[PDB]
Every structure is written in C-alpha cells, then in structure tokens.
Amino acid sequence: SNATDTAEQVIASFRILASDKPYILAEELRRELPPDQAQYCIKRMPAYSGPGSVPGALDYAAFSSALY
Amino acid sequence: TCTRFTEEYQLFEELGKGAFSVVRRCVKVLAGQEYAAKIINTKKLSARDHQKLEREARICRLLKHPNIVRLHDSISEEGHHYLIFDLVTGGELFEDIVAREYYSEADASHCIQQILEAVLHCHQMGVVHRDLKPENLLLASKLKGAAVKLADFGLAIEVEGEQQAWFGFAGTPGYLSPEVLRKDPYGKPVDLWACGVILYILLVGYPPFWDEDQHRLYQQIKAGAYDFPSPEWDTVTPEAKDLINKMLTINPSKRITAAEALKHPWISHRSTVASCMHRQETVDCLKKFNARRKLKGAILAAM
Ligand SMILES: Nc1ncnc2c1ncn2[C@@H]1O[C@H](COP(=O)(O)OP(=O)(O)NP(=O)(O)O)[C@@H](O)[C@H]1O
Numbered sequence: 294s295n296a297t298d299t300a301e302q303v304i305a306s307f308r309i310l311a312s313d314k315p316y317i318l319a320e321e322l323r324r325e326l327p328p329d330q331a332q333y334c335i336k337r338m339p340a341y342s343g344p345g346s347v348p349g350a351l352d353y354a355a356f357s358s359a360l361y
Numbered sequence: 362t363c364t365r366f367t368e369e370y371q372l373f374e375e376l377g378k379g380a381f382s383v384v385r386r387c388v389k390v391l392a393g394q395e396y397a398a399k400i401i402n403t404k405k406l407s408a409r410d411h412q413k414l415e416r417e418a419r420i421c422r423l424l425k426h427p428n429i430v431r432l433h434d435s436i437s438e439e440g441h442h443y444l445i446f447d448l449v450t451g452g453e454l455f456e457d458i459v460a461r462e463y464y465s466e467a468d469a470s471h472c473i474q475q476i477l478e479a480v481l482h483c484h485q486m487g488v489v490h491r492d493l494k495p496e497n498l499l500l501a502s503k504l505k506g507a508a509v510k511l512a513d514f515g516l517a518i519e520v521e522g523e524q525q526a527w528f529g530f531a532g533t534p535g536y537l538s539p540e541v542l543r544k545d546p547y548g549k550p551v552d553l554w555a556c557g558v559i560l561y562i563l564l565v566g567y568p569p570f571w572d573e574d575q576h577r578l579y580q581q582i583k584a585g586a587y588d589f590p591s592p593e594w595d596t597v598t599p600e601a602k603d604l605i606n607k608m609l610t611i612n613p614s615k616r617i618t619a620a621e622a623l624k625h626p627w628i629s630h631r632s633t634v635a636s637c638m639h640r641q642e643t644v645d646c647l648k649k650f651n652a653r654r655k656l657k658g659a660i661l662a663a664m
C-alpha cells in the first residue's frame with residue numbers, strides 16, 4: 294500500500310466526509326471515524342468562522358495544514 | 362563495492378511510500394527508459410526483516426502476468442536493495458473509479474476478472490498474496506481500459522501445492538479471512554475471501570465487515586455476518602450476489618477458487634449476465650470509503 298499522506302488529500306477527505314461543506318461537525322466525525330479518532334479531531338480542530346459557518350462548525354482545513 | 366543502481370539509474374520523484382520502502386521513479390540512463398524503483402534501506406533491518414525482503418524479491422521475480430507488477434531488475438548495494446519494476450502510472454483502482462464517475466456491475470465484473478486472473482497466476486506458481494486490498498490494486502496507465510495490476514508482494518508466501526499451514530497472522534483487518542482469525546492452517550483460499558470483500562465494495566462502495574471495535578469486527582468476520590441490505594442491493598443481479606456468497610464462504614474448503622470464480626457466469630458471461638446500469642450510490646460511497654481510509658492512516662500518522 295501507499296502510505297503517503299498529503300495535506301490536499303487530508304483536507305479533501307475531510308471535505309468528502311463533511312459532504313462538501315467547508316467545515317465539519319462533531320457528529321459527522323463521530324459517525325464517520327472510530328470513536329478514538331473522532332474525539333481526537335474534535336479536541337484539536339479550531340472553530341470555523343469562514344463563509345457559511347454554523348454552531349459547532351470545525352475548521353478541518355486549519356487542523357490539516359497545521360500538520361501536513 | 363559494486364554499485365550498479367547508483368551507476369546506471371537516475372532517481373526522480375517519489376511515486377509512493379510504504380512502512381519500510383520508498384518508491385521513486387527512475388531512469389536507466391543509458392537507455393532513457395523509466396521504471397519504478399522500490400528502495401529498501403537495509404542498514405537497520407533485523408534478520409527476520411532481511412528474510413522477508415529476500416522473500417519479496419524472489420516472489421516478484423517469479424511472477425510474470427499482465428495483471429501483476431513486473432520486475433525489471435533487482436540490485437543489491439551496501440545499505441540498500443532496489444526492486445526495479447515496470448512503471449504503472451494509472452494510480453489506485455478505487456481512485457480511478459471515483460474519478461471516472463460512472464460504474465456498473467459490468468465494470469466491476471471486468472475488474473474482478475483481472476484480479477482473479479492475477480490471483481490464479483499467483484496460486485499456479487505456489488504464491489499466496491495474503492494482502493489483497495484496494496491499496497494494492499493499481500492501474501497500468503491513465504488510458505481508459507488500462508489493466509489492473511496487483512502490487513505489494515511484501516506479505517506474500519510460498520505454499521507447496523494445496524498443503525495448508527499456520528503461516529502466521531498477517532494481513533489487513535477488514536480483509537482477513539475467518540480461518541486466519543481462528544488461527545487455523547490456511548492457504549490459497551484466503552485470497553479468495555479478500556476478493557469477495559473487494560467485490561462487495563466494488564458493487565456498493567462500502568465494506569461488508571466494519572466495526573470500530575476490532576474484536577467485534579473479527580467476531581463478525583468469523584461469523585460471516587454480512588448482509589445485502591435494501592435499497593442498494595435491490596438492483597444488484599442475483600448472479601453477482603451469488604459470486605460474493607461463494608467467495609465469502611466461511612469454510613475455506615467450500616469457498617470458490619480463483620479458477621472456479623473465473624467460470625462463474627457473472628464473470629464468464631458478463632455481457633449477458635452483469636447489469637450495465639450505472640450505480641451512482643456506489644461511486645458516492647466509494648468516495649467516502651477512500652476518504653475514511655486516507656484519514657484513518659493520516660490521523661494515526663499524526664498521533
Ligand atoms: N511499479 C510501480 N509503478 C508505479 N508506482 C508504483 C509501483 N510500485 C509501487 N508504486 C507506488 O508505490 C506505492 C508503494 O508500493 P508498495 O509495493 O505497496 O510498497 P510497500 O512498502 O510494500 N507498502 P506497505 O507494505 O503497505 O507499507 C504503491 O502504492 C504505488 O503508489
């Protein structure tokens with residue numbers, strides 16, 4: 294298997310799991326990821342305040358490029 | 362003091378990476394011909410890891426088939442081993458399905474036929490791959506209709522005829538066979554179970570066995586507890602479901618073989634048996650499947 298993970302792939306994967314929204318929700322993370330991996334991003338993703346923000350919106354893009 | 366790869370090949374960009382390898386494009390300089398160099402740094406490998414590396418190199422040299430990666434050259438230098446393969450440029454099969462947008466049973470049948478031809482070839486050569494999964498299914502090029510290429514013989518083993526043995530707990534959790542999970546002797550049928558898992562995903566875009574609790578996942582696999590739920594399975598032909606059932610048979614002695622699967626009507630009579638209907642929900646699910654896979658590894662890599 295290919296173990297290469299890039300920021301563009303991580304952001305696009307989060308965006309896919311967020312059904313193409315520019316932010317992701319906690320309940321979407323809990324539905325789609327292992328409970329352990331769901332709590333990790335919930336704790337480390339900053340609040341999303343960009344266009345179309347709603348209560349609970351998490352900035353997976355800021356989270357992703359912080360690492361990759 | 363012999364450095365044939367360093368002398369004769371030029372390395373370029375990374376094409377992919379494994380846990381303990383990097384794959385870089387290379388060019389045989391005198392010829393101008395491009396290849397993929399799978400490079401293993403050997404300086405800190407354990408004795409057992411050396412043996413596994415040597416095993417992969419032997420198995421790769423043995424396997425010559427249109428649906429299997431093709432070894433061009435193999436070079437040992439002081440602290441590095443190079444497996445030089447013909448370059449495949451089409452990327453992962455599952456990424457291509459999503460990118461090309463449209464997918465039917467007929468497409469899935471053509472795809473699994475090639476995977477089965479590769480598996481049959483391995484088995485005819487006394488090789489069991491043990492790690493059939495989407496990430497090891499590449500495409501030969503970006504040309505439409507490019508051949509599927511089975512890759513990554515890093516877990517493959519050599520068997521003797523039809524003898525079963527405890528070859529160890531190896532593989533990827535969602536694709537593991539009941540007999541491996543039971544710690545029973547196993548052999549060629551493990552690859553056909555994995556093919557059934559892959560075929561299931563090709564039809565609906567999500568895996569037949571899935572649980573965040575790995576203990577529970579393994580219970581479900583050992584119990585053969587998968588389903589064909591409505592609505593998505595309502596439009597899948599009975600023949601496709603029948604082939605999946607025969608691959609996902611818990612008893613490995615009753616499980617369909619690669620040779621038998623290639624004669625199954627949904628494969629051998631695909632043009633009259635497999636549906637031609639596009640399955641939008643399958644492609645949409647596959648997009649999420651690929652996303653979950655990528656994030657699973659990337660979230661662990663960040664941890
Ligand atoms: N012949 C090839 N042509 C082009 N790219 C290739 C080729 N072989 C491998 N790659 C790329 O390199 C990646 C890793 O190759 P692979 O043989 O799966 O490495 P690996 O070290 O065994 N991975 P793993 O064991 O799962 O940690 C593949 O997924 C492809 O992206």
Ligand SMILES: [Mg+2]
Pocket residue numbers: 294379513514515516
């Ligand atoms: Mg490998």
